[PDB]
Design a protein around this ligand. Sequence first.
Ligand SMILES: NC(=O)CC[C@H](N)C(=O)O
Ligand SMILES: NC(=O)CC[C@H](N)C(=O)O
Ligand SMILES: NC(=O)CC[C@H](N)C(=O)O
Ligand SMILES: NC(=O)CC[C@H](N)C(=O)O
Ligand SMILES: NC(=O)CC[C@H](N)C(=O)O
Ligand SMILES: NC(=O)CC[C@H](N)C(=O)O
Ligand SMILES: NC(=O)CC[C@H](N)C(=O)O
Ligand SMILES: NC(=O)CC[C@H](N)C(=O)O
Ligand SMILES: NC(=O)CC[C@H](N)C(=O)O
Ligand SMILES: NC(=O)CC[C@H](N)C(=O)O
Ligand SMILES: NC(=O)CC[C@H](N)C(=O)O
Ligand SMILES: NC(=O)CC[C@H](N)C(=O)O
Ligand SMILES: NC(=O)CC[C@H](N)C(=O)O
Ligand SMILES: NC(=O)CC[C@H](N)C(=O)O
Ligand SMILES: NC(=O)CC[C@H](N)C(=O)O
Ligand SMILES: NC(=O)CC[C@H](N)C(=O)O
Ligand SMILES: [Mg+2]
Ligand SMILES: [Mg+2]
Ligand SMILES: [Mg+2]
Ligand SMILES: [Mg+2]
Lengths: 150, 150, 150, 150, 150, 150, 150, 150
Amino acid sequence: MDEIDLRILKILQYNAKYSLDEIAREIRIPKSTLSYRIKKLEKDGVIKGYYAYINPASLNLDYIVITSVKAKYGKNAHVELGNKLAQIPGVWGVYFVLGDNDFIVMARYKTREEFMEKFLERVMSIPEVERTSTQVVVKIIKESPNIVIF
Amino acid sequence: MDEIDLRILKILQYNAKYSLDEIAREIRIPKSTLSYRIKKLEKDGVIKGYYAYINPASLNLDYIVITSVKAKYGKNAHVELGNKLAQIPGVWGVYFVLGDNDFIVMARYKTREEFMEKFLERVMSIPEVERTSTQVVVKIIKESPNIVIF
Amino acid sequence: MDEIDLRILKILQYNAKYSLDEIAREIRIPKSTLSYRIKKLEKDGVIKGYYAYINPASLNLDYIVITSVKAKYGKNAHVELGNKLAQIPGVWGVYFVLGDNDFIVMARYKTREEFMEKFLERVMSIPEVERTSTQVVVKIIKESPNIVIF
Amino acid sequence: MDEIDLRILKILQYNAKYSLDEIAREIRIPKSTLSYRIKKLEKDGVIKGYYAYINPASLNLDYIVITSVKAKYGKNAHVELGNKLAQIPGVWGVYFVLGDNDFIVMARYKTREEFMEKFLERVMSIPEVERTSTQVVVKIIKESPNIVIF
Amino acid sequence: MDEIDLRILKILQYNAKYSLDEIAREIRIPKSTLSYRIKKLEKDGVIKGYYAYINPASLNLDYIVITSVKAKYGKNAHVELGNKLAQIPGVWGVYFVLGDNDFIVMARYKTREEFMEKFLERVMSIPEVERTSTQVVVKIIKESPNIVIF
Amino acid sequence: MDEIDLRILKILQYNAKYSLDEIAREIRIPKSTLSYRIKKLEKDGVIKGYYAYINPASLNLDYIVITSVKAKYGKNAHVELGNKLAQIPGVWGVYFVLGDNDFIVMARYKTREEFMEKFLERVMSIPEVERTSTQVVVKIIKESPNIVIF
Amino acid sequence: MDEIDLRILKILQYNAKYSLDEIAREIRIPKSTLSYRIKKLEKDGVIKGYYAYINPASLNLDYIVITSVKAKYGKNAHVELGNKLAQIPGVWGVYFVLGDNDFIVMARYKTREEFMEKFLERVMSIPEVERTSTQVVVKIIKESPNIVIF
Amino acid sequence: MDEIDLRILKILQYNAKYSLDEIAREIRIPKSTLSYRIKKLEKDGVIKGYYAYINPASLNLDYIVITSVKAKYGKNAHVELGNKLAQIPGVWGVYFVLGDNDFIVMARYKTREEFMEKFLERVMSIPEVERTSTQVVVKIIKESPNIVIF
Ligand SMILES: NC(=O)CC[C@H](N)C(=O)O
Ligand SMILES: NC(=O)CC[C@H](N)C(=O)O
Ligand SMILES: NC(=O)CC[C@H](N)C(=O)O
Ligand SMILES: NC(=O)CC[C@H](N)C(=O)O
Ligand SMILES: NC(=O)CC[C@H](N)C(=O)O
Ligand SMILES: NC(=O)CC[C@H](N)C(=O)O
Ligand SMILES: NC(=O)CC[C@H](N)C(=O)O
Ligand SMILES: NC(=O)CC[C@H](N)C(=O)O
Ligand SMILES: NC(=O)CC[C@H](N)C(=O)O
Ligand SMILES: NC(=O)CC[C@H](N)C(=O)O
Ligand SMILES: NC(=O)CC[C@H](N)C(=O)O
Ligand SMILES: NC(=O)CC[C@H](N)C(=O)O
Ligand SMILES: NC(=O)CC[C@H](N)C(=O)O
Ligand SMILES: NC(=O)CC[C@H](N)C(=O)O
Ligand SMILES: NC(=O)CC[C@H](N)C(=O)O
Ligand SMILES: NC(=O)CC[C@H](N)C(=O)O
Ligand SMILES: [Mg+2]
Ligand SMILES: [Mg+2]
Ligand SMILES: [Mg+2]
Ligand SMILES: [Mg+2]
């Protein structure tokens, strides 16, 4: 892609509901060229899709957690655990990291009970889990993963 | 909102580019009622917007980090630091948490150098920062923050 | 319950040996209405009972400890351990928490020996216990769990 | 005190609303001797008072925390901090301990917001506070501080 | 024992090679009373013996270590480990403590090799040992365990 | 010194109250040669003195602690702190070590109060002290610093 | 060896491609004596060999790591693990240390993927490995192991 | 560079004292082409120089340390500290890393005293140093930084 695609993406990452006109007029190129470039970006998998950004509060997702998981070493344990963690309802982020913890898990729940029943109890029963340490998020100062071009 | 809104959102959180027909036909309600409900959800701020989901790899965002920041206690330090962290280019997530660290920062960069220059050096110069500990993400097993209804 | 019940409870949490007169006269309501409301609160389980507040020193409970317990992950280990900990003589508090430790145990003993024999040795033999870390309380600056309305 | 006082206290620590008859009949001594012994125990400060045991849930005290506080060393910092911590609304327990933390603070709040505003923000502004680490209690397996004789 | 015994012990803890005369003359009591009191203290096990204080340097005991040992929980593991640690040549101190470590071991060796072969390798093979962490002493600012009366 | 001195010291480190005869007869050398060698060892400072081994329990030294101290870096802080620690009554051991702590302090007191007043409060007021962490010794499995030849 | 050998080595550790003349003329000794001394040093194993110092960047060795490994205690585990770690491609340094970690491993790789596949995955499958913690080197301020005489 | 340069370097990294003949004959290319390629590699800075590999033991470098340094945050502290650390005699490695420590320092000394005087005391006086933690190397299982092509 070129500098022009970047300008297009920088817009779509913020607002995907702009008309081709508004975007074409802003970036200064013909609407048909824009439409082509956008379809192009999707074909090449640069743009994997379009989503509605839903306010978590609106769904009463008040119990936000960031859990560090240490896996029992050996075998294929790490790959297996990673996947078992990604399948848990409420978990939207699973990262394998370098440090004192193996995985960092991002999850959201409506309440403490939901969290205990849907996430904690489950994880504590997963075989390859050595230990977990959950940090409760008391305030989201920022959460805009959609902004990839800064 | 009602059970019907939930079904609508569960779709839009995955694919916001469905036609009113496809959605109306799936949920079994008239297209005009759907259109109204969607506009309604936006007005009430349930749906805050629509974004293009851009593949980070496509932008060579290879250096992914999860940094824990400890703030120097006192004054208005915490609120100030939180905000200074959210303004750093590449940082898309800033969380105030309960535990041994004050903030958890999610950031992405193309390379180690970009990371050092844009993020690390900056943060180490921020007054209210007592200490930082960065965990490098070697593998993203899952990152779908858009899925709020599970 | 209403604001009036709150005023009643705020008194009973401090001194349950006040006469109906003294309380009725303070809150400005008829003694029979008070008596009814109190019986009401007990029926609904708001007031679970009345206890004598006994000075621990008077019983030579000089060895006060706050022990963090880490459980071995898996199975039904956590629920089982929690219960085995609550049954140990001298233990009055058992909490399951989010952090690097699973349970926080509050206990009191007359001496170091009593502590070793009644608590430590027992806990170290409990199967589901991975590790324990005891913090000895050298000074109780405050311990008024009875004050729930502040 | 003697073995008889112990039997009396063991009862009062559980239920202070027993009639002199019921207690006198159980322990097998004359009601007047019992009444005297009880008044005696109060005079000597063994029994410091009687409280109503109020269910915290009934007051929506859902946010339970156990916070470790590290004080900045020097001066009279420790004594001062201990006291400033004991005065915070919602805090019912403050302990000075031997270990990696100076104080362990037990507090209860209705919600996360109340906790942030009444406790966290306050503590982070206290001068003699070096650091704090809060463990959120997700389950109270046991909390019977009233039971001193086991 | 009385204040007089204390004065006697305070002397013997520093220098056990004083004549009865010198001590008797200092404390102002008859030599025969002193001799009796000393024999008395030994009989009652107050004075368990007399030792020559040997300079460790003179024996080339240059490798001084303070090792923290964590035991595997369960069974009779703790008592067993404690004893196995006390039997290792070079180890003069073994303490069971409250904290994140179970035992603190004081040992001395002529060199790193002696330490590795006599202590480290041995301990790492002891079954009930979960982990060890050795802190090398680079400077003895003070080591006068003989001074019990200060 | 030679192998013979070693045999002599190995005896004196255990029992310094043996007669020259008993020792001379055991090691198989003339009493006058022994007496000379012993005086020799003292002159050369191999034997720095003779002490009475006093049972700490006999003096009610029940509160045994092992405290790790972290010093504030810079200046001549370390040397100064080391010395201030060695002067505290009850402290018999002070070690500068390699690890996460700067000094390891061995102390003994009759009670918790004595410990708080004589040691803790003092140390917390020492300027060059950054932090302290005290591990309470609940059991002395072994404490024979006098045994240097094993 | 003597002071002269030291001067020779101090040169060879920096530049082994100096002519015998240049070195002989600098240190002020006959070329034949120098040649002899150098051959001598090699025979005695003081000089174990000569290497070309290759710039790691030139080989795209961009992923530099320092990994701490904790071994499972018991048996011959430590010796075995040490050796298994030294055989891993990319690993140039393996150290057994005193502290909270057993081994410190120095390794270099071209990328994160190479690191994951060649080092991490391998190590996590090694039986005697209890845990690993990798610190990513973002900047080499200095790496001159060749300088032994300073 | 090409595959041929790699083969050349793979040899020179192990033994730089091979004749052009031996190398030319092994890799199967003309001696003049080899000589050219080698000079080429040096010009381009691939080969930065040739060193004698000196056995550290031969120089009595028995005290090997790996020290983690935490810097005081702010200003230009990190860059300054890094450089001050690299200038200390005996220090051959200084790395800025991601984790709980800022720098990892590799150093070697003949004895504990040399280490204390040349390294420790110096570092503890460096202003920008917050804390240091030294791990003593008791065994070098492997140290071949010269092997860059594996
Ligand atoms: N320029 C526009 O925005 C639309 C018309 C233009 N000719 C096109 O490419 O479609
Ligand atoms: N998950 C972890 O904490 C392990 C990562 C760590 N960097 C390692 O050596 O593997
Ligand atoms: N049913 C549909 O999907 C569209 C027609 C319908 N009458 C409406 O509400 O618009
Ligand atoms: N940011 C932190 O780690 C602080 C949170 C911690 N729970 C506290 O007591 O404040
Ligand atoms: N007012 C009182 O305190 C007692 C009398 C009142 N009429 C009642 O309700 O019993
Ligand atoms: N008991 C614990 O420390 C575990 C709680 C931790 N928050 C977790 O992830 O489970
Ligand atoms: N025995 C009782 O319980 C009451 C009567 C008894 N004579 C008394 O001491 O009052
Ligand atoms: N509050 C603390 O953690 C300090 C207690 C610790 N035992 C000390 O040495 O002071
Ligand atoms: N006073 C002394 O020191 C020795 C003589 C004294 N009459 C005694 O008790 O032996
Ligand atoms: N040895 C230890 O560290 C354990 C002691 C710790 N105080 C406990 O709870 O057992
Ligand atoms: N042999 C002994 O024990 C004493 C007598 C011997 N002739 C001496 O050297 O004194
Ligand atoms: N006292 C300490 O813990 C410091 C020792 C540590 N080995 C260092 O680097 O200084
Ligand atoms: N002096 C030199 O550098 C070479 C000549 C000298 N006579 C030798 O020993 O070879
Ligand atoms: N590898 C380690 O961390 C162990 C070393 C530690 N000094 C010990 O006691 O063994
Ligand atoms: N082939 C060799 O090794 C040397 C001779 C060859 N003709 C050259 O290039 O010098
Ligand atoms: N030196 C350190 O430990 C800091 C590195 C850490 N990864 C950070 O956030 O800066
Ligand atoms: Mg999106
Ligand atoms: Mg009560
Ligand atoms: Mg002695
Ligand atoms: Mg070399």
